[PDB]
Design a protein around this motif. Structure first.
Motif, PDB file in Angstrom:
ATOM      1  N   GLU B 130      32.403  41.066  18.887  1.00  0.00           N
ATOM      2  CA  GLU B 130      31.184  40.782  19.661  1.00  0.00           C
ATOM      3  C   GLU B 130      31.440  39.748  20.760  1.00  0.00           C
ATOM      4  OE1 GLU B 130      28.521  39.451  16.643  1.00  0.00           O
ATOM      5  OE2 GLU B 130      29.369  37.423  16.524  1.00  0.00           O
ATOM      6  N   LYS B 131      32.433  38.891  20.546  1.00  0.00           N
ATOM      7  CA  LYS B 131      32.832  37.903  21.539  1.00  0.00           C
ATOM      8  C   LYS B 131      34.336  37.755  21.464  1.00  0.00           C
ATOM      9  CE  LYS B 131      32.032  33.476  20.798  1.00  0.00           C
ATOM     10  NZ  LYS B 131      31.235  32.215  20.656  1.00  0.00           N
ATOM     11  N   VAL B 132      34.960  37.545  22.614  1.00  0.00           N
ATOM     12  CA  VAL B 132      36.394  37.273  22.659  1.00  0.00           C
ATOM     13  C   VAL B 132      36.648  35.992  23.448  1.00  0.00           C
ATOM     14  CG1 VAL B 132      38.691  38.085  23.361  1.00  0.00           C
ATOM     15  CG2 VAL B 132      36.970  39.727  22.482  1.00  0.00           C
ATOM     16  N   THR B 133      37.461  35.116  22.855  1.00  0.00           N
ATOM     17  CA  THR B 133      37.907  33.897  23.484  1.00  0.00           C
ATOM     18  C   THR B 133      39.419  33.955  23.690  1.00  0.00           C
ATOM     19  OG1 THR B 133      36.175  32.702  22.247  1.00  0.00           O
ATOM     20  CG2 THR B 133      37.840  31.381  23.411  1.00  0.00           C
ATOM     21  N   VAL B 134      39.864  33.693  24.915  1.00  0.00           N
ATOM     22  CA  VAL B 134      41.298  33.707  25.224  1.00  0.00           C
ATOM     23  C   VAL B 134      41.731  32.322  25.683  1.00  0.00           C
ATOM     24  CG1 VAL B 134      43.154  34.704  26.654  1.00  0.00           C
ATOM     25  CG2 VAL B 134      41.229  36.155  25.865  1.00  0.00           C
ATOM     26  N   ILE B 135      42.605  31.688  24.903  1.00  0.00           N
ATOM     27  CA  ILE B 135      43.192  30.397  25.270  1.00  0.00           C
ATOM     28  C   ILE B 135      44.604  30.686  25.755  1.00  0.00           C
ATOM     29  CG2 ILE B 135      43.633  27.999  24.561  1.00  0.00           C
ATOM     30  CD1 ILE B 135      40.798  28.932  24.031  1.00  0.00           C
ATOM     31  N   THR B 136      44.989  30.129  26.893  1.00  0.00           N
ATOM     32  CA  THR B 136      46.278  30.469  27.483  1.00  0.00           C
ATOM     33  C   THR B 136      46.873  29.290  28.241  1.00  0.00           C
ATOM     34  OG1 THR B 136      47.423  32.229  28.771  1.00  0.00           O
ATOM     35  CG2 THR B 136      45.394  31.309  29.671  1.00  0.00           C
ATOM     36  N   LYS B 137      48.200  29.252  28.263  1.00  0.00           N
ATOM     37  CA  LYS B 137      48.963  28.224  28.954  1.00  0.00           C
ATOM     38  C   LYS B 137      50.195  28.867  29.571  1.00  0.00           C
ATOM     39  CE  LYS B 137      50.425  24.030  30.127  1.00  0.00           C
ATOM     40  NZ  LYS B 137      51.471  24.486  31.073  1.00  0.00           N
ATOM     41  N   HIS B 138      50.267  28.800  30.896  1.00  0.00           N
ATOM     42  CA  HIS B 138      51.395  29.299  31.683  1.00  0.00           C
ATOM     43  C   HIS B 138      52.148  28.083  32.219  1.00  0.00           C
ATOM     44  CE1 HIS B 138      53.443  31.044  35.187  1.00  0.00           C
ATOM     45  NE2 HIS B 138      53.216  32.244  34.685  1.00  0.00           N
TER      46      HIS B 138
END
Lengths: 207, 207
Positions: B130-138
């Motif tokens: 129902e919800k998507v959270t994307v944590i990212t580090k480049h």
């Protein structure tokens, strides 16, 4: 002309592709078209934030060019192309780790058709080609020709041939017993079978 | 917190994924693992010529982390990660052209499981979440959190949560009727079925 030795793992991969009995050779074309699609995706993505990336050519397509006189099948795209460094580094692939994972997969019941899942599908060209020539032009470098008849070595030279604008041309110098891949109806069959939903126009040239 | 509207084509894709009757929902996990594998391939390839690329972390892996209390399934990788610009630009995808090709493919007899062939497999998360959270580090940017419950908009903010070093974390806030994807034996089944030959260690965490 600069001559390089393949890393040991890539030489092994190529020898396995060349020497293993495997009748389903047609997958080479799927693998090369997939590579071309990936390259086209990359230049498309770059162009989304920097339109000038397409100054070297706005058209995004794949051409298949048979030539029975030369006994070559050429796959051309207007994708992102490869730098000299890319060419030397196993044509932009993680071929060392990819080859390991492919071998491990073959050990656990996989077959040669799954090669593309390991990022080394280019080398499937050697299912049908005795020699492969790759002409490429990336926005950040000059036009180069890579070439190899396998046997452990490849060459790289600056290409003085026809300029390409941007992208990659894979020229397959076919084995004497693999001329079926120059026949229009055979190529059409393979493209329909394996590459039907590729998101770029694929034009099969006639002779 | 910055709020953005999805491009029209992506909103359409998401609505199609959310509203179409389609029982084979398990493919979301294959698609996210495939994305993680692609991201790991990219940082591996960069590290071949620039070892310092791995100063942010040498380990190349994928973790699957179920949490029944939070009703989340998290897919973590130490791949190349995404810049803020990448996140905003449809999580590094060519989602506009990809969505078009996917729709055209669906018209010609394809089904939703082929979504990944069109470069928009991420959005299959909405089969189960129902919800998507994307944590990212480049390496070239700060840590960001992207989030969306669909309905036409997503948010991006600087992440003050746990630092990641490098890579991406996809947090699936599951629909109430999709809690089977938190069960160890179900996850194991799906990974064995669809991701058996992925070339990076996949660790399924226990609770």
């Amino acid at each position: 002309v600069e001559t390089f030795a393949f890393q040991a793992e890539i030489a092994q991969l190529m020898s396995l592709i060349i020497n293993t009995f495997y009748s389903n050779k047609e997958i080479f074309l799927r693998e090369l078209i997939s590579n071309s699609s990936d390259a086209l995706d990359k230049i498309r993505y770059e162009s989304l934030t920097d339109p000038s990336k397409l100054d070297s050519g706005k058209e995004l397509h794949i051409n298949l060019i048979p030539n029975k006189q030369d006994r070559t099948l050429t796959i051309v795209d207007t994708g992102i192309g490869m730098t000299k460094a890319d060419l030397i580094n196993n044509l932009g692939t993680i071929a060392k780790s990819g080859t390991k994972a492919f071998m491990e997969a073959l050990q656990a019941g996989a077959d040669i058709s799954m090669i593309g899942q390991f990022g080394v599908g280019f080398y499937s060209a050697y299912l049908v080609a005795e020699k492969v020539t790759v002409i490429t032009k990336h926005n950040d470098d000059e036009q180069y020709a890579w070439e190899s008849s396998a046997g452990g070595s490849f060459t790289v030279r600056t290409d003085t041939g026809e300029p390409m604008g941007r992208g990659t041309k894979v020229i397959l110098h076919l084995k004497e017993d693999q001329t079926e891949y120059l026949e229009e109806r055979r190529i059409k069959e393979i493209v329909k079978k394996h590459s039907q939903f590729i998101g770029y126009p694929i034009t099969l040239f006639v002779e």
